[PDB]
């Protein structure tokens, strides 16, 4: 383990982060929206689970055009919400519990809502003029309409532009029309970016910071015409020039040393940024001690498998041996290295694992749960679960595109009306995506209990914000979940129990390899400690699966697995249907 420098203990390498969505999780007072005494009401549930630390997402002062993503002032808490006081007091009562608390960096872009935009928009000459990016038109169209700077795509479909009136011309926007992209090239724009959404929550006790796009925020000069990738649409992907910029690590260095300065009782502060995409090579300098950049990232290769690399919502075929090399994606790097990496499978921006990897069906979903489970207790790296996870939520199900609150869906849909026509092929395919991959999945209220017809996440008069999910009438809530010994959340107490006691192997693993890295079924591994090997085989299937033991003796003892722990023969060389097993040999 010595010539592994990435085994070096830190609080945040060995945590389990709970994932919390801040309007989906608990309402406390029957407006429909979650806030934070209902977070609050419900941080000894989540302690119970196992969890060593909480990600909120954005809870700050927001307009909700894109769910908190949009952020209107870093430095107050959405009312609706909460007063910052009840915020403080949350923070509080986390660390009164050995919990760990981060907060969602969101700088890409900011509110169109902000002081800092209403100011910037309001002419050309203000001093916050260039916090943006603005431009002029590169010309009208035959209909005399303003023909935005460039071909660029927002990340919600159509263009990465919109006109201002006002002062006649557009601004640049990745996300939806409300969210400006902050301009980084602009220093008096990042300082003011960091004493509001990083310093203030420093002062205030986070533990750290889960960086939203934080490898949006350097953009190639002149911001070029992107490449015509995709033949079927107006607009490109601006990848080239906006993803892993040419001064993005500058800027991460940058910030990182703000916060150690900023920092006034020696904490260790943790950073996860979404990175989205990146080389082995840009993994590395993102997350290198050395490098004083970020703790780890998130790398999307395994949520996009079964999705074009062209658009999200066209779905196209993958087999397992895709997943397995997305996921190990997510880690490999890291091996003789000081980086570090995370384990996931679901977001608020993700549909749910089991529909998407496992098998929904009534007969598969609770054993392919604790198959995903088993899984992730063996993965090297900063475990992340998301609400509703550990209860095996699964997708929703024959929802009309109208009901979906999504703006990344709605954004989508006008853009294929648009350039394509609402009765079009290119329709059908986005409708047949949305149903497997919308982040709305995610994003339905947590399910508390059986209870009529709000799950116990508001009270029976309340009308949530957003629809419930089918699934808690089928049993897929806390309080039915906890009574019964055989559901998934009380495995998933157990998978956490498993990882901890076993952290030297299940967190901080290394030389991890694959064992029969084409199967289609079979999803084996090896990993080392010192003297440890830990050997995984997972059956992805409804299919019995064979497995072999690589240089197998009797020192291999089953550990951990999914099916009755009395009733399985350790020997045995077949998986049954969905079975997981996690051997440890000494
Ligand atoms: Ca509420």
Redesign the pocket.
Known sequence: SSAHPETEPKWWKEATFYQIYPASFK?????????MK?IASKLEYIKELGADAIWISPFYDSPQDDMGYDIANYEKVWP?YGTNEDCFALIEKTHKLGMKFITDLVINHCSSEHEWFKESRSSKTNPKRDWFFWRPPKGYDAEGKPIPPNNWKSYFGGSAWTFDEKTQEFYLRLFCSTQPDLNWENEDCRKAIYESAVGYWLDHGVDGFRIDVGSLYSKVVGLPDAPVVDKNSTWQSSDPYTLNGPRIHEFHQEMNQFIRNRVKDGREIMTVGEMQHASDETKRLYTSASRHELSELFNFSHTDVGTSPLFRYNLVPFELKDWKIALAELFRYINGTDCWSTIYLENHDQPRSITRFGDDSPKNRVISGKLLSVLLSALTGTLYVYQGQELGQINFKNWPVEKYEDVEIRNNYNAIKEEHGENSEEMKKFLEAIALISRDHARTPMQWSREEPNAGF?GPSAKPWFYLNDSFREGINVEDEIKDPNSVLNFWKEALKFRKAHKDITVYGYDFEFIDLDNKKLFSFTKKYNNKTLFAALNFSSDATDFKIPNDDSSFKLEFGNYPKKEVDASSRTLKPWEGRIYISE
Not at 27 to 35: E, K
């Open positions: 309402d406390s007072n029957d407006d429909g929206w979650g806030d209902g609706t508001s």
